[PDB]
Amino acid sequence: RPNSVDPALRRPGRFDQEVEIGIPDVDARFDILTKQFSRMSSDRHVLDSEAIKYIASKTHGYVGADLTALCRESVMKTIQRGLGTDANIDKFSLKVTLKDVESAMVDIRPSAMREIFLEMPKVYWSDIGGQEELKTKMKEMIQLPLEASETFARLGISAPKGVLLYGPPGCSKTLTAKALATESGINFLAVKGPEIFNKYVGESERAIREIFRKARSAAPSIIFFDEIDALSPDRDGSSTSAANHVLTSLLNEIDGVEELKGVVIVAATNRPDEIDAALLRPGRLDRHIYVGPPDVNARLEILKKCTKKFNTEESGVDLHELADRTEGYSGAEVVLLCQEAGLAAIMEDLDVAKVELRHFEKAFKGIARGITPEMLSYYEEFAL
Amino acid sequence: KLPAEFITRPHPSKDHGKETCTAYIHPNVLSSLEINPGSFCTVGKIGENGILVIARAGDEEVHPVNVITLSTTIRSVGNLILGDRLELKKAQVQPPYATKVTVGSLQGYNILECMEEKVIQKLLDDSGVIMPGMIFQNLKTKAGDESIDVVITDASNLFYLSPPFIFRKGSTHITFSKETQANRKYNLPEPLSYAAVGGLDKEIESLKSAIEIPLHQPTLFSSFGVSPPRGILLHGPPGTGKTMLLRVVANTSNAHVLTINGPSIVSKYLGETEAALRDIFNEARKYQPSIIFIDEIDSIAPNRANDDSGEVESRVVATLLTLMDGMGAAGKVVVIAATNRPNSVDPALRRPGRFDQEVEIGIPDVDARFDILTKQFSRMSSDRHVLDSEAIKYIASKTHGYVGADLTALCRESVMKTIQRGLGTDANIDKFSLKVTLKDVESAMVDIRPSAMREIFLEMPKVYWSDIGGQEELKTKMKEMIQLPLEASETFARLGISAPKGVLLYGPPGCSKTLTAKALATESGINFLAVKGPEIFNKYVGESERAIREIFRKARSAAPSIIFFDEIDALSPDRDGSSTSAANHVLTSLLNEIDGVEELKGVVIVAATNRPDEIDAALLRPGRLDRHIYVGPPDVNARLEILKKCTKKFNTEESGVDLHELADRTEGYSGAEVVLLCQEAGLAAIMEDLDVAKVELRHFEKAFKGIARGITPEMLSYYEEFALRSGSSS
Amino acid sequence: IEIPLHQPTLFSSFGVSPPRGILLHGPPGTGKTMLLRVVANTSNAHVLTINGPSIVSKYLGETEAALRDIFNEARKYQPSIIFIDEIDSIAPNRANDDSGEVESRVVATLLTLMDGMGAAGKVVVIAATNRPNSVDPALRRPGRFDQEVEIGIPDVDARFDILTKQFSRMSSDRHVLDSEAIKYIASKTHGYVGADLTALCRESVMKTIQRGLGTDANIDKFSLKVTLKDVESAMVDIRPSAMREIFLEMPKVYWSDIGGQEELKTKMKEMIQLPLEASETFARLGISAPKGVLLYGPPGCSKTLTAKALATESGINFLAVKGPEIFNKYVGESERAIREIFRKARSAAPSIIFFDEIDALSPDRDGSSTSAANHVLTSLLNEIDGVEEL
Numbered sequence A: 001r002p003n004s005v006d007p008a009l010r011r012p013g014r015f016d017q018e019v020e021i022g023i024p025d026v027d028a029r030f031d032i033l034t035k036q037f038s039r040m041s042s043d044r045h046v047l048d049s050e051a052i053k054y055i056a057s058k059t060h061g062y063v064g065a066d067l068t069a070l071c072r073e074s075v076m077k078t079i080q081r082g083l084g085t086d087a088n089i090d091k092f093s094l095k096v097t098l099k100d101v102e103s104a105m106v107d108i109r110p111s112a113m114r115e116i117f118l119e120m121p122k123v124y125w126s127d128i129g130g131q132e133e134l135k136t137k138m139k140e141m142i143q144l145p146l147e148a149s150e151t152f153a154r155l156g157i158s159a160p161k162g163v164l165l166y167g168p169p170g171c172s173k174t175l176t177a178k179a180l181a182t183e184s185g186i187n188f189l190a191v192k193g194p195e196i197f198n199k200y201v202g203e204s205e206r207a208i209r210e211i212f213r214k215a216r217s218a219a220p221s222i223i224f225f226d227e228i229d230a231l232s233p234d235r236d237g238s239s240t241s242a243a244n245h246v247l248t249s250l251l252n253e254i255d256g257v258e259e260l261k262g263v264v265i266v267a268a269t270n271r272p273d274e275i276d277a278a279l280l281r282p283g284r285l286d287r288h289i290y291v292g293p294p295d296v297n298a299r300l301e302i303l304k305k306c307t308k309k310f311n312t313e314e315s316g317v318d319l320h321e322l323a324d325r326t327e328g329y330s331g332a333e334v335v336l337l338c339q340e341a342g343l344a345a346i347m348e349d350l351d352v353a354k355v356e357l358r359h360f361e362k363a364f365k366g367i368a369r370g371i372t373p374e375m376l377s378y379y380e381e382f383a384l
Numbered sequence B: 001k002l003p004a005e006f007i008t009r010p011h012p013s014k015d016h017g018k019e020t021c022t023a024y025i026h027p028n029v030l031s032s033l034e035i036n037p038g039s040f041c042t043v044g045k046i047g048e049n050g051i052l053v054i055a056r057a058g059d060e061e062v063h064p065v066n067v068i069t070l071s072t073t074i075r076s077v078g079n080l081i082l083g084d085r086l087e088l089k090k091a092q093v094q095p096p097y098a099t100k101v102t103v104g105s106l107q108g109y110n111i112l113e114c115m116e117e118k119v120i121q122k123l124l125d126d127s128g129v130i131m132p133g134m135i136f137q138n139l140k141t142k143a144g145d146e147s148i149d150v151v152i153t154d155a156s157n158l159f160y161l162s163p164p165f166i167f168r169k170g171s172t173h174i175t176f177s178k179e180t181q182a183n184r185k186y187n188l189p190e191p192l193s194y195a196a197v198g199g200l201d202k203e204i205e206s207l208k209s210a211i212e213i214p215l216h217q218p219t220l221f222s223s224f225g226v227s228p229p230r231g232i233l234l235h236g237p238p239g240t241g242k243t244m245l246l247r248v249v250a251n252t253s254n255a256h257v258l259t260i261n262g263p264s265i266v267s268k269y270l271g272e273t274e275a276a277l278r279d280i281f282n283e284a285r286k287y288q289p290s291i292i293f294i295d296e297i298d299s300i301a302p303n304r305a306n307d308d309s310g311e312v313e314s315r316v317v318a319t320l321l322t323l324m325d326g327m328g329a330a331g332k333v334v335v336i337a338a339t340n341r342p343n344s345v346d347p348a349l350r351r352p353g354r355f356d357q358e359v360e361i362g363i364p365d366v367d368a369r370f371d372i373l374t375k376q377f378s379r380m381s382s383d384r385h386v387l388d389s390e391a392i393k394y395i396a397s398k399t400h401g402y403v404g405a406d407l408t409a410l411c412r413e414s415v416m417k418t419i420q421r422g423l424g425t426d427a428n429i430d431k432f433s434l435k436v437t438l439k440d441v442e443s444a445m446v447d448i449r450p451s452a453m454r455e456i457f458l459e460m461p462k463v464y465w466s467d468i469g470g471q472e473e474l475k476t477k478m479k480e481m482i483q484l485p486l487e488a489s490e491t492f493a494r495l496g497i498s499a500p501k502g503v504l505l506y507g508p509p510g511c512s513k514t515l516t517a518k519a520l521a522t523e524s525g526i527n528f529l530a531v532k533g534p535e536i537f538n539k540y541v542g543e544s545e546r547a548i549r550e551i552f553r554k555a556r557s558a559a560p561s562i563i564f565f566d567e568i569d570a571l572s573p574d575r576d577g578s579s580t581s582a583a584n585h586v587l588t589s590l591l592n593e594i595d596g597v598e599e600l601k602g603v604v605i606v607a608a609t610n611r612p613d614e615i616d617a618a619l620l621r622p623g624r625l626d627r628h629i630y631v632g633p634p635d636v637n638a639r640l641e642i643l644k645k646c647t648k649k650f651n652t653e654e655s656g657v658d659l660h661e662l663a664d665r666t667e668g669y670s671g672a673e674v675v676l677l678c679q680e681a682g683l684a685a686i687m688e689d690l691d692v693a694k695v696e697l698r699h700f701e702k703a704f705k706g707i708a709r710g711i712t713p714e715m716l717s718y719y720e721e722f723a724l725r726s727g728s729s730s
Numbered sequence C: 001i002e003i004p005l006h007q008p009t010l011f012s013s014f015g016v017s018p019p020r021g022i023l024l025h026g027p028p029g030t031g032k033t034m035l036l037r038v039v040a041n042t043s044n045a046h047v048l049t050i051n052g053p054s055i056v057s058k059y060l061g062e063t064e065a066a067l068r069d070i071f072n073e074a075r076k077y078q079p080s081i082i083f084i085d086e087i088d089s090i091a092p093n094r095a096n097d098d099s100g101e102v103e104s105r106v107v108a109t110l111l112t113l114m115d116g117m118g119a120a121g122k123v124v125v126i127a128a129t130n131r132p133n134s135v136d137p138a139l140r141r142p143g144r145f146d147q148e149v150e151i152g153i154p155d156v157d158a159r160f161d162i163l164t165k166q167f168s169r170m171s172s173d174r175h176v177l178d179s180e181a182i183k184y185i186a187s188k189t190h191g192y193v194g195a196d197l198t199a200l201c202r203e204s205v206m207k208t209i210q211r212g213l214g215t216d217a218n219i220d221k222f223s224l225k226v227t228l229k230d231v232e233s234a235m236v237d238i239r240p241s242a243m244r245e246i247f248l249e250m251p252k253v254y255w256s257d258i259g260g261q262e263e264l265k266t267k268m269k270e271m272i273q274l275p276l277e278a279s280e281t282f283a284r285l286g287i288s289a290p291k292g293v294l295l296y297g298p299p300g301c302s303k304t305l306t307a308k309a310l311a312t313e314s315g316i317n318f319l320a321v322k323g324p325e326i327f328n329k330y331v332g333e334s335e336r337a338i339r340e341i342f343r344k345a346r347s348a349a350p351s352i353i354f355f356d357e358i359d360a361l362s363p364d365r366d367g368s369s370t371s372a373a374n375h376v377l378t379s380l381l382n383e384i385d386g387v388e389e390l
Ligand SMILES: Nc1ncnc2c1ncn2[C@@H]1O[C@H](COP(=O)(O)OP(=O)(O)OP(O)(O)=S)[C@@H](O)[C@H]1O
Pocket: A127, A128, A129, A169, A170, A171, A172, A173, A174, A175, A226, A227, A268, A269, A302, A330, A331, A332, A333, A335, A336, B591, B592, B595, B618, B621, B622, B623
C-alpha cells in the first residue's frame, strides 16, 4: 500500500523513481510457470511447451503468488489419486497430468479474487440470445481498443471512452457487461451497491482511493459502476448543502486516465435522469448506447435457449409462432415464460420433459410486461 | 524445582512386553514426591480422576524433565491425546485382586478369532495393575486376519476413572464377551473417527489428504519441487461442527497435539503474552511431527483496518507472521485455524504462504441431513426403535434450514419427550428402557428451533388455510412456489430449471394478504421471515443497508427461507421528489441482493402492498417480482366459508342466522367486513342477556344498519389497470 | 437442572450428551432474578454468581483468566451451577460499533469454555438477560444454551396465583377467606408484571398503620390487619412499570359530568368494561371485542374529553400520544416512536392509545403530501393491523 505510507517519506529526494507492479499477462504467465516448473522439469513430462498455454489462458486474473499455490494443490490432486487405487503405491513414481491441474482450480481461491468479492455465475454468449447488432457495436468500441491499444497510439484516433447503457427493464445490460470478460477477456470489477456510504465521515471517502489504488491491474483493470443511482441519486440539483462532497471525489479521479490508456467508465442504468447533468462533458460520456427491446428474431434464439431441455418439436410446438406472439416482452420477460409454464406442467401429473403448447398459453395470460419503454422522456438528444 | 506442567509422549518401544503398564516419568520427580521406582502413582487430567500408572525411573540425561513417557495402552483408556497436561498424584491403597476381567474387541470380532487363550495369559502377565478400558493393537495374527484389537471392556475406586485391580494369571476368572462399546455404567469416552461425522464426508477426505501426508511423508513434496502447504484455514457457519473437526484430527492423527482456543495466551505482563506463542511453537518443533490447533483465530487476529484494534493484539498476530515463515522445518508441523467469519481474518494471514489450504465447512443439505441423522442413532441402537432408511429420511427432509447443531438438540429433546410421557404414566417407571418413536420427534420439532431464528421475535398467531375462504387461485400458486421446489427438486434438475423467486401480491383491504403470511408461518415446511417496515430505515448514514444486510445474512445460511415484506411500497423510494435522501440507496441494495442468490439457492421474496402502482419499475423486472396475483375481494362462495370460519362455534344450525341469506346480502364484503358484522351483532346479544346460548337474526339487523364498505369502487379500478397495464389491448 | 445433576446413568444409555445451558429473557419485573435464587437454594450443587461486571478487571488478561479458573472450579466440584446475572452486559452482540477488543476476548472465553467439551462432567450454566437480541448470536447455538425460556408478562390467571401466595404467606394478617377478595384484587390488577404485585403488598402495609394510628397513635404495630380497602387505595396509587415513564398531569374526568352522548357511552362499555366482566362470554362464543373506533364531527363537541376518562373508570392502563408528537427530523426516529410507544403499550397491556388529529399523520397516499408522512403512515398501518394480532 504505497498510498498508506506517509507522504513525507514519498516526497522527492527520498524515492525519485518508483515502479508499480501489475498483474502478469498471458505472455508473462508462461515464463513464470516455465521457471516455477523448471524445478519439476522432466518429472512431469506432460509440458511439451503447449500445456502451459492452456493453463495460462484459463488461469486468468492470478496475481502470481497463487500460481505457486496452484502447484501445491496440483500435488494434492496426485499422490492421493495414486494412493486411492493402491495402498502401498510408490508416491515418487506418480506423475501429474493435465486433469489434475485443471481440477485443482476448484479448491483454489486466488488472493486477488478473494479481495474482489464477486459471484459471476460464468455467463457466456450462449445465454445472450439475439442482440446480434448490439454485439458488433460493442466489439468495435471495447474489444478492438483493448486488444489493439498499442495500434491506436500510432493511428491517433480518439477512443470512445465512457460507455453507458440505458433501456427498458429486463434487457441484458449487466448480462452483456460481465459476459465479455469470460471469452479470453480481462479482469472485471464492480461495486456491490451499498459502498458509497459506510459509516463515519472520511472512512468511505478514503475507500474511494482504495478502489482506485489498484488502477491498471493487468492490461488494464476495469471498474464497472452498476446501479449508478447508488452514487449520486440526489443532492446535486436540489438540496445540495454540504453533503455532495462524496460525488466530487468520484468525479475528480476519473479525468486522470487520459484517453488511449484502456481505463474507461462503463455503467448500467435505466433512468436517464439518474445520469445527472455532470457526465455530459466532452470526455466523460460522448457516445450513448440504447439497449432497447429485442425484436422478433432475437426472441426466436432466446426461446430456443430457454427451451433447450424441452422437447418442443417432439410434443408438437412451433417455435416461430411463440416468438411472434411474445411481442412486447423485454428481455427477461421472455425467459420468465417457461418458468411459470414449467410449474403448471409439473403439477399436472409427474411431468418428465413433456411440455406442450398449452403450457406456454397458460403462463402467457399471467405475466405482466414492461410499461412505457421510452425512458424518462429523453433518450436521443442528451441536452436539457 | 518441581514444575506442575507435563506433557505426554508415546513409549519408544512398542512390543507388548513388560512396559504394558510400567511408565517412565522422571528420575527426580519421583524422588521429590517420595515415590519409589516401581511404587504407585496417579496420573490424570486437571480436575479429572487420574489413572493409576506404574512409576519408573528413566535416563535423566536424555529424558527431559517436562516430558512424561507412557505405555501403548494408557492413552487409549482415558482418550489421553498426546500433549495434554497431567496432574501427578499418588495412591495409598493396595488394589483389590481382580475377581473377573472381561475381554472384548472394538472391531466387532469375537476373541475366538484371535490368538489362543494360552497366549492371552502371556499377553498380559507382567502388567501388574489392570483397569477397564485397556486397548492394545498391532497384535500377532495366527490366521490371515487384516487387523485385530483387544479392549478390556470391564473388570471386577476413590477419585479413579476406572476401578483399580491387580491381575493374576492362573487365578483370575476370565469371561469371553462380544461387547464392542465401552461400558456405559463407567461413563467411558469413545474415540472419534471420520465416519463418526455425518454429512460432511467430502470435506473430511480433503482434510485427511492434507494432514496425513505432511505428518508422515514430508519428503514427498520436497522431492516434488515445492514445500508442502503450511497452515489450514478451516471456516464454516456456526453450528456446522467446526470445533469437533479439530478434535477429530487430533483423535485421528498420532502426533503431538497443542490446542490454542480463545484468549488463553493473554497475560498481565507485557512480555509474557508474546512469549507464550514462542514457547508453544518451540515445543511443537521439538517433538515433530506435531499439530497446533487454533480456534477462533479472528478473536486474537484483528483485521487491523478498523480503529478498535489494540496494540497488544497487533503484536500477537504479528508474532505468528514472523514465526510461520521463520522456521527451519519443511512443513512437518501443521497449523489449523477455526473461525466462523471469513472476512474477519487478518489481511496478512490471508496472504499466500500462510493459509494455503482453505476448506469451507458446508451447511448440510437435505441429502446430508439423512446421513448425519442415520449415524446418530447407531450409538443408541439399544433403545432406538426407529425405522431404517424410512423414518430418518422423513425427519431429515422436514429439518429445513438446519445447520447441524440443532439435530443434536432435537435428538436430546426426543429423549425429554419420553421422560414427560414416561413419568406421567408412572412416576416410578424405568426410564432406561424408554424408546423414541416417530411422534416424539414430531413433538420435539416444535420445541427445537434453528439457531438462525434466535434473533427474530414475532408473535405470529396461528392462522391456517381454513382462515382464508374462497381463494383457490391463491392456494394454487403457493403450493407450486413452495412445496414443489423442495418436494420435487429432481424434476427441476431434470428440466435444468429453477422456479421463479418473485411474486407481487396485491389484495383489497380486509382480504388475506398478510393473513396468508400467517398461514405461511403455519403451513410452509421451512423457515419464515417477516419485516415490520419501514423499520429498516435508520437515522445513521449507511445503517439502512446494514440493517437489510444483517437480516438478509441469515437467509443465506438458513437457505431455503421465505421472507415476507409487508407494505413494500415504503421500501421503494418515492419518485415525487420529497425526502429522497436515503431511500434511494435502499432500492439499490435490495436489487443487488436479489441477484446474489442465483447459485441454486432457495431464497424466496414475498411482497404485498396496498399501492401496486407506487413501486419502482425495477421491481417489475423478472426475477424480483415474477408473479402478479390478484387476491380479490371475497365472493359469495368465499363468504360462505368465511362465515363458517369464525361462526363455527356459534349454534346457528339449530335456529336463526342463515349463511345463504347473509351471502346474498353481503355482496362486496371483505374478510374483515364479515368479521366486523359478527363483532357488532354479537355485542347486541350480550347486552340483552349476560348468558348467551343462541344468536337471533335481529342482532345482525341492527349491525347491518351501521356498517360501511371498506372496498371503494375506485379501489378495484386501481388494481385492474395495474393487472393489465402493458398497453391494455396491445 | 435435576436430571443433568442427579441422574448420570440415564444419559449413559443414550448416545447424546446431557443438555447444558439455560438462558432466561423477557421484560424486567417478571421475576428472572428470583428464579435464580430458588434454584440455588433448592438444588444441592455448587453455585457460582456473576453479577454484571463482577469478573471484569483493569488488567488485560485478568478478566479472561478469572473465567477459566471459575469454570475450572465447577469442573473440579461437580455438580455445579453457574449464574451470570445480566449476561448480556458482559456478552454483547459483537455487532455494534461500540464493541472493541475488550469485549472480544471476554465473549470469546464463553465460546471456548462452553463448547460442550471444555467443562463437561456435571456442570450446568444458567443465565439471564433483559435484551435477548443484544447478546452474541454465537452463544445461542446448541452446545452453549440449548433451551431458551421466555418469561412473559403474567396474565390474569398467573397474577392471581402469584398474588394469592404473597397475601397468604403469613396467613395471620390475611383478613380475607375463600380468596374472594384475592381474586377480585388479582382481577383488577392489569399489567402487574409481579414487581408491582410485590409493590401492591408493600403499599398495602403503607395504607394501613397510618389509618390505625390515625384515630389513636398508641397501639401495637404487630396487631394491625390488612383490609380490602387498603389494597384498593394501594393499587390506584401504583403505576405500571411501563407507565412509570409517562409524565402527564391527567385531570380527572367523570362520565356523569358529560351530558348527553348516550350512544357514544353505550358502545364504550362494550369495548373495555365488557371484556373485563364477561371474559367467559368470549370464550364461549369465540369472538374478540372490537379495538378500533373513529370519532368525527363538527368542532366544539366533547371528542378529546371521552378518552381522558378511559384511565379513570375502566380498570385498565392508558397511554396518551399527542398525535404528530411522534414526528422526528431523523429518518430512523420518525417511525421509531411508533414502535417504542406501542412497546410500552404491550408492556402495559391492556392499554388504550388515543391519537389527536390523525388526518395529518394519515395522508391519502394518492400522489400527494410528503414522504415523511407517508413513511409514518405505512408504519402506522402495519403496527395497528399487520403481522401482529395486537
Ligand atoms: N439472453 C437473455 N436475454 C434476456 N434476458 C435474459 C437472457 N438470459 C437471461 N435473462 C434474464 O435476465 C435477467 C437479468 O436482467 P437484468 O436486465 O440484468 O436485470 P436489471 O433489472 O437490469 O438489473 P441489473 O442492472 O442487471 S443489476 C436474468 O435474471 C435472466 O432471467
